[PDB]
Structure formats: structure tokens, C-alpha cells
Amino acid sequence: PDDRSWLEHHVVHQYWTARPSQFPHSLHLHSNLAAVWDQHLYSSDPLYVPDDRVLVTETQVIRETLWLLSGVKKLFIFQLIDGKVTVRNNIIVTHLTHSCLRSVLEQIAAYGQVVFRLQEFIDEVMGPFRTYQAFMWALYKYFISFKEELAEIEKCIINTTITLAIVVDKLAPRLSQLKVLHKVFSTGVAETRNVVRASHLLNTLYKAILEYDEQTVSLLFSLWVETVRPYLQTVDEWIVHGHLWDGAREFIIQRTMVSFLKPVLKQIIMAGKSMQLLKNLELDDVHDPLLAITFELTLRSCLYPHIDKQYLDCCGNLMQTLKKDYRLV
Amino acid sequence: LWEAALTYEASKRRCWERVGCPPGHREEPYLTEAGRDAFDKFCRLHQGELQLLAGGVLQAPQPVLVKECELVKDVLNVLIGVVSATFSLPESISSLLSEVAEYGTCYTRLSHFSLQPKGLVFQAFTSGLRRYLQYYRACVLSTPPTLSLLTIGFLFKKLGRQLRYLAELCGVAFPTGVKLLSYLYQEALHNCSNEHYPVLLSLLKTSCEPYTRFIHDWVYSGVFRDAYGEFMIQVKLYWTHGYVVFLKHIAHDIYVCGKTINLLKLC
Amino acid sequence: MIHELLLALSGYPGSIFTWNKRSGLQVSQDFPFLHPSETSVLNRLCRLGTDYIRFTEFIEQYTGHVQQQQGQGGLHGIYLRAFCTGLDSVLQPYRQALLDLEQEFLGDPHLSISHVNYFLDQFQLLFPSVMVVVEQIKSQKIHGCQILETVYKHSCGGLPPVRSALEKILAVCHGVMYKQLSAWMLHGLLLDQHEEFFIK
Structure with a gap:
């Protein structure tokens, strides 16, 4: 009445309260399919009850999807x-009698389960492990650009409306990457120590780059560099501060492993020790300019000179100060 | 064309409700769609849900008012000191207004405390507060020349709190004379760095001008100057110069240099 | 709706979104020009504004207590006059972002509440991480130079926004400390602030 009459007659509330649909009708086919679909229901037996529920139009389902x-x-x-x-x-959509529509929304909800798992890993910090945190950060940097597209598409419904098939085929280059993200997250929650709990995710990430070596592998690369930020930061701390960062031994070195830094690993240990044995008498910010300006084949062999030159400087200086004023020979 | 063409036009969506030979009719609008025209319907409805639990008499003023711009102009008049039609000297407009009224009500409490320019250093402190008044009147109605509602609250949130600190500094007994000038002195040691620190420094820089003028008297003319008793040295053996801010180490030098100038006047 | 929410997100406790000490900024009025799934969206959003209210309360509550009435008591010291000075500075870009939202709603007023929550998903990364530092400062008796310690433990962080916010807060605290070290190295003055800056 008055205000409530305007609210019911121009907008919904037959979708959260069991009321007949106010989406306009006429007679016959698309207008009111109710008579002929009731006849088809009666002829093939509607069992013992005609199929009737609350009923909603397509666009509400489109913006909900x-x-x-x-x-x-x-x-x-x-x-x-x-x-x-x-x-x-328990909602009728009159044509298809929501059985084919059940299959298509079941596939869409199966993708929504992946979306729920990623947002659940997001929610378990906001509202430390320090490697999960760097993981959920690049996950955020994906999702901001991701649902930007869906907001843009949902604007075009209001400005005439656009069907469901166009907008589910529009999001295909994102859902193709969402399957890759689904396989990425599976070993990130599958798991004893905090070092193997990070190694299980990071070795899977290092292996998944070789699986696609299009648009997925670039996402995997940009995700992969931003999850080894604590390890590059910790290695640089082991060089220039002379001390391994401690997190109840988040790091690999006790003071199996991933293969990201194993072929240069002897150049790392012999670096960090050589700082503290010098004192007993930055590096990530060089790697990221390379990321600013084929991946894990040639670019991976360019990481190793960065630690190799600093390693050579440290060990050569330590050898030099032991070969003069003590003079081992 | 335009509205008639849009009203006619068949949709690119065909529903899964019904298929085959549509005449076509538009979108079903949403409920968060167009969120600035249906406040009135629900301000009545929330009032009804409140009245059901409250028995029938609780009510809630402001189901709407007024515009964006008229509300902005009244809120801008609050900070100057003119109260609105809802004061004398949707439902959460009052939730805005309580924080912009309070910042208003202390501003008058400086201008009422600067209605007159006692003690001469007290007048210097009042004239120092007048400089913050002259800054604040230039701040308002240049950056918000009737813009939207929240720019008013955002711009004077970092600025209104700085004003509310100055409300705490003033009385609106209250220290006066040298008891004021030491009290402003010790405060500057109490606040080394804050957003209120340059305002206290600007008050203290002009609050010591008459004291330096009193210090200038004994050296250059040998004059003991008092008009309310607003100088630290106040009132024999040959000289009647007064004897019981700076330290006492300089005050004794001032006391003896007045006597020296009294001797050198006859030289 | 898209100014009323932006008022509740700022330094006002609303009345539409009711401020409570057990659950801040509850939406309970289920508006029939909101979609019912926006309720959960508001439940996602309101934690951010609740944190903004708490930081606003922390600046309003504490300034040398009131006006200088050893140095224990509650939460003061020249360093937390600096900390509230820094806390106001980290709440400034949130005001700028709400101004950008207001200008956007001059552009397009048909955008739903989920667009607003999406736009302010960037500040749900900064604010919950810096909330815990202020909670540790409130729960433990850390109000002296160890507040610079408990900021510096968390300012070495893992996210570029929380690094910038704790950088601002730590910076103004070092500014106070270097002025009192200037009194140490030029005037020989100690206990500029009584027992609160590396001096017996």
C-alpha cells in the first residue's frame, strides 16, 4: 500500500518472500508460458502436483552468478x-523446469567453490607464516583486476540487458586461469614443520611453470616471484646482515627442499657463513628490475649471477684478509 | 527517440522463464539500483519496525532533509558559530552532525574569549589566538564553496581536532600575568612534536613580545614598568627598584643594570 | 546509502550502522532498497570502518592524557603524542579515497554497494594488520621508547601498504627522538621528557 505497493510493483520482493512474479505477462509462449507448460505438465503426468514455485526472471540470476x-x-x-x-x-524457472538450469548452475557453483576456497584462504588472516602472506598478496593482486571485469559487465545489464550466455562466455579467459589456480591451491592447504609446509606449495608452483612451458604461465610466473619474496629477502639478510632470519626455522637450512635455489645453493651457504666468519675477527631489489624489463629457462639462469657476484666479493674478501697479516702460506 | 525508443526496444536477453516469440520488456530493476531516491519509503518503514518494538511512541526525526547543498551550507554555518534550525545556542544525519557541532561550539568559545583584546601579556596571548581565528576563517569557504556533504567532514577532521586542543588550552579562574606566561612556557616543553606544536610555538613567539619590551627598559633607560603587575620582577637601600620567562641568572643582571643606569643618568 | 555508508566508515559511529563495543557497525535494518546479499557485503565492509573508528577514538582519547593533568599511567609520553600525530597521518588517505568515491557517485549513481566494498578492498589489507599493533600497545604497558620497538617489529612487513603506514608512524616517533638527541648533543640536556628516552 502506497510505498509498499510501489516497492512491490516496480522492483522484486517476490524473490526473498514467496510471492507471485511481478515480471510482466500477456498470453501464449513468451508472454505467459504458464498455460501451455501446464498442459505439457498435465499430459506427461506432473506426478501428482503441478510444478510451481516462487519463480524468478533471468537477470536476477545473472547478477547473482x-x-x-x-x-x-x-x-x-x-x-x-x-x-x-x-x-x-526450490525456485521454479518455468521453461526447462529448472533441470537443465540445475546442471548449468551446478557447474557455475562448482567454479564458485574454487572462488570460496581462495577467499577462505584470504579470510584466515584478515578479519604469521610470512610465505602464505606473500601468496595471498599476489592472490589479491589477481582478484582486484579480476572482479573489475565483472563489475564492468554488470554495469551493462542496467544500461538493454545482456543474456547469461554472453556473460559466461565473456569470462572464459579468467575461468581457464581459475582451473590453474584450483590446482595451485590444492597443495597449499594439503600440508609438519613450517619449512615443509611452504616447500610443498613452492615446489608445486616451481613444477607448474614447466607444465605450460599462453596467458596462464605468465600469471603463474607473476604469482611465483611474489611467493619467494621472503626467501630472497632472507638470503640477502644472510649475506649483508650476517644472520639467517628465524621464524621457528621457516628457512631450509638448519641453523626435503625446493629446487628453485638448489643449483646455486652451495653459492648461498658459503656466502652467509663467510660474512659471520668475517665479523668474528637489496638483492631482491636487483632481481625485480629484471622482472620489470621463455620463463624458468633463460630468466632463471640470470638470477644466479646476482647472488654469485655478491658471494664472490664476500668470499674473496674473507680469503684476502686471511692471506695477509696471518698469511696461511 | 530516447525514452520512447528505449521503452519500445526488444531486449538482447530472452528469459529462461519463457521462450519463443517474445514482445520483449527490459530489465527488472534492482533494489540497490538507484540508491538515492527511496530513503523516504524506508525511513517510514524503519520507523514502523521501531514502533512495533517500542509500543508505539519512540519516533525518529529526520526521515529526510533537505538537499545536499542546503545541508552543506548549514553545516558550514555551524563551524562559524551560527546554529541551524535543529539547534539552539535519514536517521544518521544526526550521526554526522554531532561531531561537526562540537567543533563548532568550541570555536565560539575562542571568539567569545577573543571578543576583547588584565595584563599586557594576556592581551598578547589573546592577539595570538586571533591569528588562528584569522587563519581558520580563510580556511573555510575557499576549499568548500558548497561542495558535497562529506568533503566538509573530511576537510575539518584533521583541522577540527587541532582546534579542539586549543579549546582545552583556554579556560573557555584562568592564569594571567606571569602565571600565564610561565604556563604557556611549560606547555611548550610538554609538547615537543605534535600537530598542535606549531600553534603553541606561534602563540609563544608572540606571547613574549611585551616581556622582551619590559627587559628592554632597565638596560636602555633604567625604567621599572608595571601596569597590572605583569612582569616577573616586582617590588629601599638607595634604590627603590623592584626585587623579590627567563632564568633568575639574567633577572639579577637586570636588577643591577637598572641601578647602574640610575647612576649613569647623573654622570 | 552511498554517502551514508561513507559517513559511517569515517570518524562518526553512525546510527544506521550501530556502534557497539561487542560488535561495531552492525547493519540490522534490512532495507527494501538493498539487495539481501548486500547484508553480508556490509558485514565484510563494516570491520574496516570499525577499525577506522577505533583509530579515530585513539587519537581523540589520548594527548598527554588531557593537558598535563613518573610516566606510566595509561598511554602517553612524547612518543605517543607523536604516535597519535602519525595515526592521523595514516588515516588521511582513507579520507582521500572516500572523496574519490563521492566524486565517482557524481559520475555514476547506479553502482551497487558491492562496487563500494570492492573499491575499499585495498584498505582491508592495511587496516587489519596495523590494528593488532595498536591492540598490543593497549593490552601491554608499552608506551615509551618500546612503542618504537613494537612498531619496528611490525614495520618490516610483507605488504607495501602496511609498510607505508607503519613507516609514517615510526617516522614521527624518530623525529621526536632526534630532537631530544639534539638537546643531548648541543645543550647537554637529559630528561627532556622525564624517564622516557634512553636516560636514567
């Missing part, structure tokens, strides 16, 4: 029933 794939969760459809989102099937 884009909200679910966008990153936010717990909607009216795609309810989380036991830990994984799935379609609410």
Missing part, C-alpha cells in the same frame, strides 16, 4: 549447505 564468481559469497541462490556452495532448487 556474477556476484558469486566475483568473490562475494552466501547469496540467496548458491547457498552453502555443508561447506560447498550449490544451487537452491
